[PDB]
Design an enzyme around this catalytic site. Structure first.
Site, mmCIF file in Angstrom:
data_model
loop_
_atom_site.group_PDB
_atom_site.id
_atom_site.type_symbol
_atom_site.label_atom_id
_atom_site.label_comp_id
_atom_site.label_asym_id
_atom_site.label_seq_id
_atom_site.Cartn_x
_atom_site.Cartn_y
_atom_site.Cartn_z
ATOM 1 N N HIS A 72 43.010 35.642 40.782
ATOM 2 C CA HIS A 72 41.672 35.053 40.922
ATOM 3 C C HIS A 72 40.619 35.448 41.693
ATOM 4 C CE1 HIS A 72 40.884 31.070 38.824
ATOM 5 N NE2 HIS A 72 42.313 31.303 38.614
ATOM 6 N N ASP A 130 40.277 23.777 46.062
ATOM 7 C CA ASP A 130 39.845 22.883 44.970
ATOM 8 C C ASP A 130 40.750 23.044 43.687
ATOM 9 O OD1 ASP A 130 37.623 21.860 46.780
ATOM 10 O OD2 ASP A 130 36.370 23.568 46.086
ATOM 11 N N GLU A 241 33.103 16.548 50.517
ATOM 12 C CA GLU A 241 32.198 17.601 49.780
ATOM 13 C C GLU A 241 31.028 17.201 49.121
ATOM 14 O OE1 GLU A 241 36.069 20.393 48.293
ATOM 15 O OE2 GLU A 241 34.305 20.505 47.109
HETATM 16 C C1 LIG Z 1 39.717 31.224 40.286
HETATM 17 C C2 LIG Z 1 39.175 30.208 41.302
HETATM 18 C C3 LIG Z 1 39.524 30.830 42.591
HETATM 19 C C4 LIG Z 1 39.171 29.839 44.055
HETATM 20 C C5 LIG Z 1 38.839 28.788 43.620
HETATM 21 C C6 LIG Z 1 38.688 27.911 42.284
HETATM 22 C C7 LIG Z 1 38.888 28.924 41.250
HETATM 23 C C8 LIG Z 1 39.020 28.430 39.911
HETATM 24 N N1 LIG Z 1 38.647 27.510 44.577
HETATM 25 C C9 LIG Z 1 38.909 28.041 45.845
HETATM 26 C C10 LIG Z 1 38.837 26.986 46.919
HETATM 27 O O1 LIG Z 1 38.651 25.728 46.664
HETATM 28 N N2 LIG Z 1 38.738 27.527 48.161
HETATM 29 C C11 LIG Z 1 39.015 28.923 48.413
HETATM 30 O O2 LIG Z 1 39.399 29.169 49.656
HETATM 31 N N3 LIG Z 1 39.267 29.752 47.546
HETATM 32 C C12 LIG Z 1 39.024 29.444 46.271
HETATM 33 N N4 LIG Z 1 39.130 30.400 45.360
HETATM 34 C C13 LIG Z 1 39.201 31.713 45.567
HETATM 35 C C14 LIG Z 1 40.787 32.236 46.005
HETATM 36 O O3 LIG Z 1 41.169 31.265 46.975
HETATM 37 C C15 LIG Z 1 40.926 33.323 45.825
HETATM 38 O O4 LIG Z 1 40.601 34.197 44.757
HETATM 39 C C16 LIG Z 1 42.361 33.865 46.769
HETATM 40 O O5 LIG Z 1 42.412 35.374 46.246
HETATM 41 C C17 LIG Z 1 43.789 33.350 46.040
HETATM 42 O O6 LIG Z 1 44.000 33.821 44.511
HETATM 43 P P1 LIG Z 1 45.276 34.555 44.027
HETATM 44 O O7 LIG Z 1 46.625 33.840 44.551
HETATM 45 O O8 LIG Z 1 44.997 34.625 42.749
HETATM 46 O O9 LIG Z 1 45.473 35.999 44.831
HETATM 47 P P2 LIG Z 1 44.912 37.227 44.105
HETATM 48 O O10 LIG Z 1 43.457 36.809 43.800
HETATM 49 O O11 LIG Z 1 45.599 38.116 43.233
HETATM 50 O O12 LIG Z 1 44.464 38.369 45.261
HETATM 51 C C18 LIG Z 1 43.670 38.028 46.465
HETATM 52 C C19 LIG Z 1 43.753 39.243 47.348
HETATM 53 O O13 LIG Z 1 45.084 38.949 48.225
HETATM 54 C C20 LIG Z 1 45.702 40.105 47.988
HETATM 55 N N5 LIG Z 1 47.087 39.274 48.104
HETATM 56 C C21 LIG Z 1 47.588 38.568 47.146
HETATM 57 N N6 LIG Z 1 48.770 38.063 47.033
HETATM 58 C C22 LIG Z 1 49.043 38.775 48.446
HETATM 59 C C23 LIG Z 1 50.173 38.235 49.217
HETATM 60 N N7 LIG Z 1 51.363 37.750 48.915
HETATM 61 N N8 LIG Z 1 50.475 39.002 50.446
HETATM 62 C C24 LIG Z 1 49.280 39.642 50.738
HETATM 63 N N9 LIG Z 1 48.118 39.960 50.048
HETATM 64 C C25 LIG Z 1 48.037 39.528 49.018
HETATM 65 C C26 LIG Z 1 45.253 40.749 46.897
HETATM 66 O O14 LIG Z 1 45.978 42.203 46.744
HETATM 67 C C27 LIG Z 1 43.928 40.607 46.971
HETATM 68 O O15 LIG Z 1 43.309 41.634 47.928
#
Ligand SMILES: *Cc1cc2c(cc1C)nc1c(=O)[nH]c(=O)nc-1n2C[C@H](O)[C@H](O)[C@H](O)COP(=O)(O)OP(=O)(O)OC[C@H]1O[C@@H](n2cnc3c(N)ncnc32)[C@H](O)[C@@H]1O
Length: 488
Positions: A72, A130, A241
């Site tokens: 995401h 959310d 909100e």
């Molecule tokens: C797509 C989206 C995003 C979103 C949202 C609604 C939608 C439709 N609503 C949010 C909300 O209400 N409040 C909020 O705080 N954030 C919200 N978002 C954004 C979302 O939280 C972030 O994009 C977040 O990154 C979580 O998504 P995801 O699980 O998909 O993780 P990622 O996107 O692949 O990578 C995020 C970053 O963190 C590092 N990463 C990933 N997993 C780990 C673990 N296990 N340990 C350490 N680091 C980790 C990734 O490398 C990257 O830098």
């Protein structure tokens, strides 16, 4: 060959070297970076061994490791150019346990799945996002904010323990009492300090039902004063909100599909056309037996508010239904092939003192339309966000979350990633010029200097934690804070 010693490793899981394209894309649909390899981990031992190997090559290797949750991210923060992407969701095995009013959840678990398991015990996490199809690791690497943070803080404020694979390949368990620096560092750490393979999340008794409420305001000063008072109120609403509705027509008819109006007569006439409106979205959690107690409890809280009486729309849905609400939206957008589109989002943290000033230039001037995507606006209490973490928040006790959740379904015209980009540039330009004191959420800075400006006084602590837990800057390269093998 730097990928041949990878293929040699006796993994529980395995590496993929050719079919890697999905790991070269994210929700933002703007950045694409082809990884060299994708680890499909069969165990945390596999993640530890992979980071250990990359570490063992020291400074003279361009290899980097990125953990991917649900992808995401907006600007490739989950991607690794010619590096390794760890498909965290691939980490399988019955590791999701509920005990002592807590849930130990893997890093690659989705919050929706955590909830579905946790409800079987009549419990649930206190704070949310959310959208629940996000990983535990990914949100904890950020903050994780929804309408419960005013009360319980972000998700990062409701975590008790973490299992982390550091950038040296160390499997460490940490909390406020043991290896505490690593614990606080990882929270809002942008994956810089290690990979969150497990997290212990605080639970509370789950309500069976929610009274979901929406009301409209024509005056921002009133909308904000009413918001700031409900976030400070004792025995207030369970979720708080708000959304800015710019140049959209018949919004109350676009509500009737889900919500029931308190007086459908006056609501049928109300015009949304040409005037910037403001929505206050509230919930009160309740159990069936307590329906009557709740109705009286709600009426009192609503009675102190300055909203447009005809606009009061309400519905009674199950807790899960309200929590999973965005998945419905996702489903519709997917059907119209509008989900896998560029999302040039802008997520701002505005201090209370600058909010009316901000809304004046942004909604009154800068923006002529919001139709392109929703605008979230809601205040939170700094008192609920620990300063020991990596989370960058403004100094004021009350700050607003402002998210321009915009889509770009077109190659030209109004949306159009270049139009969205300009509007985003203008808002940012104004926040600097007019001394707003804004800090970005889910930031996407390309240089260390822009990042240093972002952290400000927090930089020294961040670089200290960086050298400490990831000296070769192997982890989360897409954040762009630390070039591989960079630290002084
Ligand atoms: C797509 C989206 C995003 C979103 C949202 C609604 C939608 C439709 N609503 C949010 C909300 O209400 N409040 C909020 O705080 N954030 C919200 N978002 C954004 C979302 O939280 C972030 O994009 C977040 O990154 C979580 O998504 P995801 O699980 O998909 O993780 P990622 O996107 O692949 O990578 C995020 C970053 O963190 C590092 N990463 C990933 N997993 C780990 C673990 N296990 N340990 C350490 N680091 C980790 C990734 O490398 C990257 O830098």
């Amino acid at each position: 060959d730097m990928l041949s010693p990878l293929g040699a490793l006796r993994l529980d899981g395995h590496f993929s070297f050719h079919d890697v394209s999905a790991m070269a894309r994210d929700f933002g649909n703007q950045c694409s970076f082809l990884p060299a390899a994708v680890l499909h981990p069969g165990s945390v031992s596999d993640i530890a061994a992979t980071v250990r190997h990359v570490f063992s090559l020291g400074e003279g290797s361009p290899l980097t490791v990125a953990a991917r949750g649900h992808g995401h991210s907006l600007m490739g923060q989950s991607q690794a150019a010619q590096g390794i992407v760890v498909r965290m969701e691939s980490l399988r095995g019955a590791r999701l346990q509920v005990h002592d009013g807590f849930v130990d959840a893997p890093g690659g678990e989705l919050w929706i799945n955590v909830l579905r398991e946790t409800l079987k015990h009549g419990l649930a996490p206190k704070s949310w996002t959310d959208y629940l199809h996000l990983t535990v690791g990914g949100t904890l690497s950020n903050a994780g904010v929804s309408g419960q943070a005013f009360r319980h803080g972000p998700q990062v404020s409701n975590v008790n323990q973490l299992e982390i694979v550091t950038g040296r390949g160390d499997v460490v368990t940490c909390s406020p009492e043991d290896n505490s620096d690593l614990f606080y560092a990882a929270l809002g750490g942008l994956g810089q300090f290690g990979i969150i393979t497990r997290a212990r999340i605080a639970l509370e008794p789950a309500p069976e039902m929610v009274r979901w409420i929406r009301v409209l305001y024509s005056d921002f000063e009133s909308f904000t004063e009413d918001q700031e008072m409900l976030i400070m109120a004792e025995n207030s609403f369970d979720y708080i909100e708000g959304f800015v509705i710019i140049n959209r027509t018949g919004i109350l008819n676009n509500w009737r599909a889900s919500f029931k109006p308190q007086d459908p007569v006056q609501a049928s006439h109300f015009q949304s056309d040409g005037r910037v409106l403001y929505c206050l979205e509230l919930t009160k959690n309740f159990n069936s037996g307590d329906t009557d107690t709740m109705e009286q409890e709600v009426a009192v809280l609503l009675s102190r508010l300055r909203f447009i009486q005809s606009t009061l729309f309400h519905t009674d849905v199950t807790y899960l239904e309200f929590l999973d609400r965005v998945h419905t939206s996702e489903l519709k957008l997917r059907a119209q092939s509008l989900w896998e589109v560029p999302h040039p989002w802008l997520n701002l943290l505005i201090p209370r003192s600058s909010i009316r000033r901000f809304a004046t230039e942004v909604f009154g001037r800068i923006l002529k339309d919001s139709n392109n995507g929703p605008i979230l606006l809601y205040p939170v209490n700094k008192s609920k966000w620990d300063n020991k973490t990596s989370v960058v928040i403004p100094d004021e006790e009350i700050f607003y979350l402002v998210g321009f959740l915009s889509s770009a379904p077109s190659l030209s015209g109004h949306g159009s990633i270049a139009h969205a980009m300009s509007l985003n540039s203008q808002i940012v330009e104004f926040c600097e010029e007019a001394d707003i004191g804004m800090k970005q959420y889910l930031a996407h800075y390309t240089t260390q200097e822009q990042w240093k400006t972002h952290f400000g006084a927090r930089w020294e602590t961040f670089e200290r934690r960086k050298h400490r837990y990831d000296p070769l800057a192997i982890l989360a390269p897409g954040q762009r804070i630390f070039p591989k093998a960079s630290l002084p």
